[PDB]
Model the fold of this input.
Amino acid sequence: SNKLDSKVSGNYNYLYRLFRKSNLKPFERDISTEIYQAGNKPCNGVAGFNCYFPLRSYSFRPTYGVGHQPYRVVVLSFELLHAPATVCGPKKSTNLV
Amino acid sequence: LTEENAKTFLNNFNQEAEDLSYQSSLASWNYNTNITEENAQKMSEAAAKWSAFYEEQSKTAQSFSLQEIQTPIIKRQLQALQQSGSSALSADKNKQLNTILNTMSTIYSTGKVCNECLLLEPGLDEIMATSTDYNSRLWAWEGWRAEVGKQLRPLYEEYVVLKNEMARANNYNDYGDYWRGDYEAEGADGYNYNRNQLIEDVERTFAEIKPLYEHLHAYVRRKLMDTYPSYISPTGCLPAHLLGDMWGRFWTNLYPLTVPFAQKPNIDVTDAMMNQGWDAERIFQEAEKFFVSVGLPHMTQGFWANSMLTEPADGRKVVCHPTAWDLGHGDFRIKMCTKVTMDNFLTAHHEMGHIQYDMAYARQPFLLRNGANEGFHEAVGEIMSLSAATPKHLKSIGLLPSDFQEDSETEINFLLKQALTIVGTLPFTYMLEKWRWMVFRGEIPKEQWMKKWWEMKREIVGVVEPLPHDETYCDPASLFHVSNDYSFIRYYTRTIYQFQFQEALCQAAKYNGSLHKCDISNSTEAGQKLLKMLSLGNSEPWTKALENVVGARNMDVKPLLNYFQPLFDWLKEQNRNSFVGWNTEWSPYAD
Ligand SMILES: *[C@@H]1O[C@H](CO)[C@@H](O)[C@H](O)[C@H]1NC(C)=O
Ligand SMILES: *[C@@H]1O[C@H](CO)[C@@H](O)[C@H](O)[C@H]1NC(C)=O
Ligand SMILES: [Zn+2]
Done:
């Protein structure tokens, strides 16, 4: 939907994350500001060399390719817990004689 | 272990390159299309930060090593990271160097040659084509190099010693080794290449083409005597003012005076496209179907809607330069000063051919944002350009009627000007390679620099100056590619790379006819091999970049004679009524 949610002055408001040392298990979150540890190094608390802080941002442009485009991804998930079901789907057609 | 953390800084530098360097290419995309006085200011503000942020990563580049890398994917990914440049010395002599290159550029841009006083405009090549009198053109000839040769002499070689000082800091022999030693290859036992072997590697490439050249150089001696009898030696050399160009690398203007048969010249495309209605918007659509029917992927949709193909007639200042713009990441754009002429049609597949090579390294990051080296970038742009003059495509498109049958001599005509444009240019350019490969070292002394470039011109090229001059001339420095920061060896390396690419052009589509009349279209099974060589890019060394193409990993110019196989057997019975050889004592000014 790049025709509506972008401008030529820079749509870098949508941020992202490239890498981290650990592996996040699904169904939790982290807004943790954690320092990169390469090896024999202490923590300083400020950015610099080998303190690669992972606050990143994309490069959204309206003309930015046709395959490198913003895809608004909505992953809709369905759960059952052996319970009486509440969410019903679209029902059958109703006719009467 | 910091092997993956050294990997982490690579795509961390690209994410600050997809928004910093990509707009600086987009700002330069904006300027040569739209020239305003404020468009240059954010051009200069972005292009300086383009270098300075690349200098910002050069400060942290020397903190890591180079021999602690085992896997070959980061072996070439990291050598471009540690390329410092000339930043180790202070501002005592580097800041003075750009003040030399600007005053050498103002004399070449605002140069006037008069006592009929004209700029370095295309008109400079216009008196060289049409006018044939010498006395009205003698003052324009000697006064051309009287205002350039004396001028740029005491400023040129102070530009070379600065890079020869910094070459051994980059483990190079000279500034020529920055031009010639860029073909590094490391890896296994058969992968290791050292730098100083290309000098012998280029000698025997022309040893098999010199019997073709003197067969073609004695071809032109028969008929130019009918136009200038009292100037040219009979069985020897040639004066310097009848070359079709001031340096003799453009032998295209002289072609009405060296045509094989005067009964039928070459076929142009400017007469019949005015009848069917195919203007400048039409054949570019068939140029895209020529690019996607050979297995290569389709063009982007933004290439159709957001591109500027045709000259904007809204009072727009356009540079009118055919150039391919590599923006990257699907921002595939083009500008070309488009008309319907044949020279525009041969380059119609050139800069448009680069985008299909830009999608070869579209997967490749910013540090390796070129071809497999500096040589294969311009070769694949020209691998479809020399095949664009194939006559079987010109008959099938519908310009000539079907009853026009192409004779055996019809191929001989345009392959001659093809031979005079590149193959005739190699004896001028190959001596220019050993020009800078020996003046940069220092075996030739200070005050004999004039005659040795002429001594290479009497023996190899056979071109003698007709007026006597003094030692303080810089006629090899009269090219703006040679004088300023441009590589000229990429012009000759473009030939010998695509000369072997025309060999793999034959077995890819299962071709069996004459190799100069090649058309890769009407075949989709050719493309399954074409996606093998372009998918590797610069991530693999250049010793692997030749193996997947032909199968041999050596330089071979035997497919050049396979490219002109009807021209060699025809040429034997033409100029045998002459003596072959060279006389290095003839001079026109022996008064
Ligand atoms: C150049 O200016 C014209 C008219 O203002 C505009 O349509 C065009 O997009 C401009 N070029 C670029 C590359 O923005
Ligand atoms: C390729 O196909 C087109 C359309 O069928 C035809 O006009 C053209 O002659 C063919 N080319 C060759 C080399 O057969
Ligand atoms: Zn080229």
User: Anything to note?
Assistant: The first helix of chain B runs from residue 3 to 15. DSSP finds 27 helices and four strands in chain B.
